[PDB]
A paper describes a structure:
Here we show that components of a (PUL) from Bacteroides caccae have activities consistent with comprising a unique pathway for depolymerization of chondroitin sulfate, a common GAG. After prior desulfation by an endo-sulfatase, BcSulf, to produce unsulfated chondroitin from chondroitin sulfate, the depolymerization pathway begins with the activity of a polysaccharide lyase from family 35, BcPL35. BcPL35 activity is coupled with BcGH88, an exo-β-uronyl hydrolase, and presumably BcGH109, a confirmed α/β-N-acetylgalactosaminidase. The most unique feature of the pathway is a β-D-glucuronate dehydratase, BcGDH, which we show through structural and functional analyses primes saturated non-reducing end β-D-glucuronate residues for hydrolysis by BcGH88.
BcPL35 crystallized in the spacegroup P212121 and we solved its structure to a resolution of 1.75 Å . The interface of the two domains is characterized by a deep groove that contains the putative catalytic machinery. The groove architecture of the active site that spans the full protein suggests endo-recognition of the substrate, which is consistent with the production of oligos with a degree of polymerization from two to six. The closest structural homologs of BcPL35 are GAGase II and GAGase VII, which are endo-acting PL35 enzymes from Spirosoma fluviale and Bacteroides intestinalis DSM 17393, respectively. The relatively high RMSD values appear to reflect that BcPL35 adopts a conformation with more widely separated N- and C-terminal domains. If the domains are separately overlapped with the respective domains in either GAGase II or VI the RMSD values drop to ∼1 Å, more accurately reflecting the high structural identity of the proteins. This did suggest, however, that there may be flexibility between the domains of BcPL35, which we interrogated by normal mode analysis using El Nemo. The primary predicted mode of flexibility involved a hinge motion at the separation between the domains resulting in ∼10 Å of movement between the domains with the crystal structure approximating an intermediate conformation. An analysis of conserved residues in the putative BcPL35 active site cleft allowed us to select six highly conserved residues for mutation to alanine: R76, E228, Y232, H387, Y413, and W419. Using cCH as a substrate, the activity for the R76 A, E228 A, H387 A, and Y413 A mutants was below detectable levels.
Residue numbers in the entry: 12 to 593
The structure:
């Protein structure tokens, strides 16, 4: 029988309740989280139902997501505390959304998330709801979810929301699996068919996590994909013996680690292209930490939970699962974050350096390859963010305004690259003869030495400088806990060409000959150009140029304009939290 015999069988089982109640009693953070979620439930009890109302885009997705949060939080509070105001509020919400004319299947994410919300509450309140509500909910799940997805599996093309390569596949198949399992005792044959088709089609999306767990589309996209993926993984682990092998797909084991490990210690996101912080507190992290035995991720997510509660941050629609999924594990003292690791991806390789995290002033550095012709990308191959003492000493200026004239004209001669934020002049990489990178090139990791005493990695950037250089290689080397060396090897096509080493910063800048001192809130960082001999740093403010740009304020640029003997040589810059890098 391919489901647990009794409700609740979805995400937080009956058998799991005893241990969760003990955590709430015995673990302060879990206890604080329980009280926090109970208080959220308290206001949800007295919050109006949402009218069926499409947004400017023609869908109700925001409303479905609202009900995921409302129904999950209310039903959790009823299971943990037994106060019938939580049950009755969930009953009212269930009847309300079942009396919607539809769950807007023309934009099927709407149906996927509404079915998820409804299935969870139905399952979690099964013995505690009026029979008339259970009858109506079962019929709505059957007609609006199970019947539709069975048709979609049989008739849908590869472009179908159940089969395409985008995260719609994961979200929709997940919502359908949860709906099917929620009413499985009444539709067991349908639930088995849906389980098998979900496992068949979901790899069309999830194969793109291979090999190392990188989500090219960025953290918001990752957060939506994996919040629903973890519901699926947990549900089929609990109900179907893990059949279908989704959990073992290459890259999935490492994907939460990627998200945690690519933040600076102070929490700053590598905001390249149009990436931005919005996905923070999805409970997916606790499923990954438990299923793949990564206490490092659990410990990091608990810190995020504390901050979410302390600063009253916005909640992921599935945030309520953080409590039943609570993972109290921590890494052992002996376990260390590697000094250097690389996350390979077909579009942009990601490089991550860590000096000894237990030594104050040690360096964190993250850098990227990339393909600038891809959507939303910048001419930023080789750029890096370095952090020490809680300060990001180099920057990424983020995306500019999507409304700008020619913002999408991404051809090599296109208007997109005239904007500072889009081109390499704002990024921490090379400009030859004060020109932009070639938009149709790429930078990628071509050599790695992650186990050396001074670990290093080499990027091939040649094709980003196609008309200017016959080869361009950038090597990052961690010389010690406090010091990174960047070696650019450039074979110029013209021996008089100038190689500009550029970096952006929000720190105060003092330059003198081949040295830079950066200052921020009394903390310092240092840079020294050691090759070619006699090179000089200058500095100047970044500024706006074209009307309609997001304001560019508080950014300073560093630039070393370097000639190379015979047009062939090296630019070598050492960077350290200590002034002496001899
Ligand atoms: Mg950028
Ligand atoms: Mg590669």
């Amino acid at each position: 029988q391919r489901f647990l015999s009794n409700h609740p069988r979805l995400l937080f089982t009956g058998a799991e309740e005893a241990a969760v109640k003990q955590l709430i009693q015995n673990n302060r953070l879990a206890g604080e989280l329980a009280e926090f979620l109970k208080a959220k439930a308290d206001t949800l009890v007295i919050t109006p139902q949402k009218p069926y109302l499409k947004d400017k885009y023609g869908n109700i997705l925001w409303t479905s997501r609202s009900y995921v949060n409302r129904l999950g939080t209310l039903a959790l509070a009823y299971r943990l505390y037994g106060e019938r105001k939580y049950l009755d509020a969930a009953n009212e919400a269930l009847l309300w959304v079942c009396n919607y004319p539809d769950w807007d299947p023309p934009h099927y994410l709407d149906t996927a998330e509404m079915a998820t919300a409804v299935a969870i509450a139905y399952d979690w309140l099964y013995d505690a709801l009026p029979t008339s509500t259970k009858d109506l909910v079962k019929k709505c799940l059957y007609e609006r979810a199970i019947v539709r997805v069975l048709r979609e599996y049989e008739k849908g093309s590869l472009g179908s929301w159940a089969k395409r390569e985008t995260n719609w596949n994961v979200v929709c198949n997940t919502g359908m699996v949860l709906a099917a399992l929620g009413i499985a005792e009444d539709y067991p044959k349908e639930a088995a068919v849906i389980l098998d088709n979900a496992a068949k089609y979901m790899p069309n999306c999830l194969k793109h996590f291979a090999p190392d767990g990188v989500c090219y589309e960025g953290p918001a996209y990752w957060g939506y994909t994996t919040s629903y993926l973890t519901l699926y993984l947990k549900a089929v682990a609990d109900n179907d013996n893990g059949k279908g092998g989704i959990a073992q797909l290459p890259g999935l084991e490492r994907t939460a680690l990627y998200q945690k490990r690519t933040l600076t210690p102070s929490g700053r996101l590598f905001n390249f292209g149009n990436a931005g912080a919005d996905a923070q507190n999805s409970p997916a992290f606790f499923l990954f930490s438990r299923m793949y035995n990564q206490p490092e991720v659990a410990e990091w997510y608990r810190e995020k939970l504390k901050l979410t509660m302390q600063d009253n941050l916005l909640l992921h629609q599935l945030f309520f699962l953080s409590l039943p999924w609570f993972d109290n594990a921590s890494p052992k003292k002996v376990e260390k974050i590697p000094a250097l690791e690389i996350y390979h991806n077909t579009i942009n390789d990601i490089i991550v350096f860590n000096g000894n995290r237990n030594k104050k002033g040690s360096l964190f550095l993250i850098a990227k390859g990339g393909e600038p012709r891809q959507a939303h990308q910048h001419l930023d191959g080789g750029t890096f963010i370095v952090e020490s003492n809680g300060v990001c000493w180099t920057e990424d200026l983020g995306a500019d305004d999507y409304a700008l004239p020619g913002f999408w004209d991404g051809r090599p001669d296109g208007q997109r690259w005239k904007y500072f934020r889009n081109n390499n002049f704002s990024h921490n990489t090379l400009s030859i003869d004060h020109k932009i990178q070639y938009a149709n090139g790429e930078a990628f990791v071509c050599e790695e030495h992650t186990d050396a005493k001074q670990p290093s990695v080499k990027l091939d950037m040649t094709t980003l400088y196609k008309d200017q250089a016959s080869s361009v290689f950038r090597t990052f080397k961690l010389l010690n806990d406090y010091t990174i060396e960047i070696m650019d090897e450039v074979d110029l096509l013209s021996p008089q060409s100038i190689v500009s080493w550029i970096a952006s910063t929000k720190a105060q800048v003092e330059v003198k000959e081949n040295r830079v001192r950066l200052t921020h809130e009394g903390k310092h960082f240092y840079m020294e150009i050691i090759a070619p001999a006699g090179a000089t740093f200058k500095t100047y403010p970044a500024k706006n140029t074209y009307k309609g740009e997001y304001p560019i304020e508080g950014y300073n640029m560093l630039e070393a304009e370097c000639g190379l003997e015979g047009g062939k040589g090296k630019v070598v810059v050492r960077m350290s939290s200590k002034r002496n890098m001899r």
